[model samples]
Target chain A: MNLNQLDIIVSNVPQVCADLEHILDKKADYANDGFAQFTIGSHCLMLSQNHLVPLENFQSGIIIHIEVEDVDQNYKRLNELGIKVLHGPTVTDWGTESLLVQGPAGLVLDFYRMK
Target chain B: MNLNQLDIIVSNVPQVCADLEHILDKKADYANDGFAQFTIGSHCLMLSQNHLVPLENFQSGIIIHIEVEDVDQNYKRLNELGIKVLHGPTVTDWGTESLLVQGPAGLVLDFYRMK
Candidate 1:
């Protein structure tokens, strides 16, 4: 799969949405409801106001997911690059197979493929 | 909403999966198919092998999503914390009203709410 979108959740919905719209200079399509996604160059970022849990006890920032074409080949290449694989290549009920890798910045990246 | 899970994408499938299972000492639920999600403290991280895009030009790392409630108040709090607002507070097709903020690190975080 290709890089689809980066999803993140934060404490405030309107303010953060406003902030991003201000920077991108794009008026949000509030008519769409509680979800908004944007494209930055070749990447897409989606923002949502989540209600799964309380924000106070869990504000750990963002986790980026990179879409990939072939997990096996990429895994081989990652090994050549000396990057350590953190997890996966296994399938999920969500319909994609994935792997986890720790990048240069301690950021954990999820590499995935749709079955 | 509250903090949920982190999502990451990596190159290799089994290798990364094995690596993570080794570290976390948790056997991956591969039987669950291609989707796998984990929890870190109050947050959860999900991994999936995506096949939408080519990995070469798109390995840009991960974007962590933090879930929240009362988007307005949180926006105000972020502003007071000297955080720069990036965008949103508007809704979308996916069902969330969100905002974007620049954190201490250069990572672009999406604060969202699900309606």
Candidate 2:
């Protein structure tokens, strides 16, 4: 029901944090050798020094994961507004309900529901 | 700080939702003529039939906004893990304290704090 977590894969946690500290000119909220994080408005943005994702061209790494409350309602609203629906609402292989739409730009919007 | 919202710009809202309904074989959680949304793990992903953002190739439309509680601390953790820090921590024009790091992929991780 909310955008609670944001994570991006990285090469190293400590090095990034060190340079980060140097620039921000302060210490981190917490420090480990594997992962690091920052607190934003409502949640933490993480740098997974060891997170894994394919890094090929058009890297799937650049993904926008959006969670929503209702797939049906969102689809209706999107349709009414003339937004392009890519895949509409569909059930994921994992059983989650989701909708895919043409992003205003070069991306695709994947909005899914946990239940 | 948190990942509270995800908004994607689209051309039409109703059409997308209608087609979406067609695929999911259901109705949307909510539907209007301008914007639509879905519920996910902790937040809502929105399709804005009229959201504004640059649309050219390499479109800035693709962004990962992460809010963190501590910029300095997250940096330390990231650095320890060997993650690359692109620009370190800096103050935004809007006066937010933040840090930038190399994304495992082609993206940059922008972790920031409101204060």
Candidate 3:
């Protein structure tokens, strides 16, 4: 449950990336497809296009990312608590294991761990 | 700019606060008037109700808060850059000066400084 990053949903990823770069005085740490990630101190700002995910429930605004010591453990715990999990304890191309869940007030929380 | 907190917009503030408490293993640091604030390391997770602000643009999800040395300085800079500011550089009852501005992808950035 360690809060890690904030993901912003925008129509144009590049423009948002540029805006954050100017405001934060740092370049993007990663960018690919329709997503761009910027490092802000220890945290991160991830910008993505509106249709980045295929699911209809994945509408954009702000998404919170929490980094955990163990994703599988929390996944099981949240499952036992009947929390609605949307996707994965799946590994991503960037070498991180991630799980997406429906958070309070229709927001999405992506729980991840660096592998 | 220093990131100070992540504000989450939820329909039920109390319930979301409880859920975060269970997940984070910490009690809320502040609770009042449809808002609850939880401390997480050097940052915070703020749970707030929708319609907390009267403006139509103040919708839910994730809001990023950046703490600055001077709100007025950044306010002027952003204004000169032609950024759309929503409100404030005004002092709140909680003894913090805050400014709300429309950020990348329609997310509202709440820049504040403690008194």
Which candidate tops TM-score? 3
- lDDT digits (tens) for residues A1-115 of candidate 2: 1235555454566875665443223466786886776554455545555533323222121224455676788788778766677677889678788777654214344566764
Q: Candidate 2 chain B: minimum summed lDDT over ten consecutive residues — where?
A: B54-63
Q: Could you give candidate 1's per-residue lDDT for residues B1-115 as a string of tens digits?
A: 1112344444344554554443333565551344565553344455555632223311322344445666676677666655666674667898887767543223345566776
What value does DockQ give for candidate 3?
A: 0.04
TM-score of the candidate numbered 1?
A: 0.32
Top-lDDT candidate index: 3
Model 2: lDDT of residue B14: 76
Best of the candidates, DockQ: 2
Question: Model 2 segments beyond 4 Å from truth?
Answer: A1-63, A92-95, B1-63, B80-82, B92-95
| lDDT tens digits, residue span A1-115, model 3 | 2344555655556765665454333689888657888775577667766532222222433335566667887688668766777785889788788777664334455666876
lDDT of 3 by residue, B1-115 (tens): 2344555655567766665454334699988667888776567777666532221222433335556667888788777766677774789787788777664323455666775
Q: Score the docking of each candidate (DockQ).
A: 0.08, 0.12, 0.04
**Model 2: lDDT of residue A20:** 45
- TM-score for all models, in order of appearance: 0.32, 0.43, 0.48
Better of 1 and 3 by lDDT: 3
Which CAPRI category fits model 3? Answer: incorrect
- The alpha-carbon root-mean-square deviation between model 2 and the true structure, to one decimal in Å, is 17.0
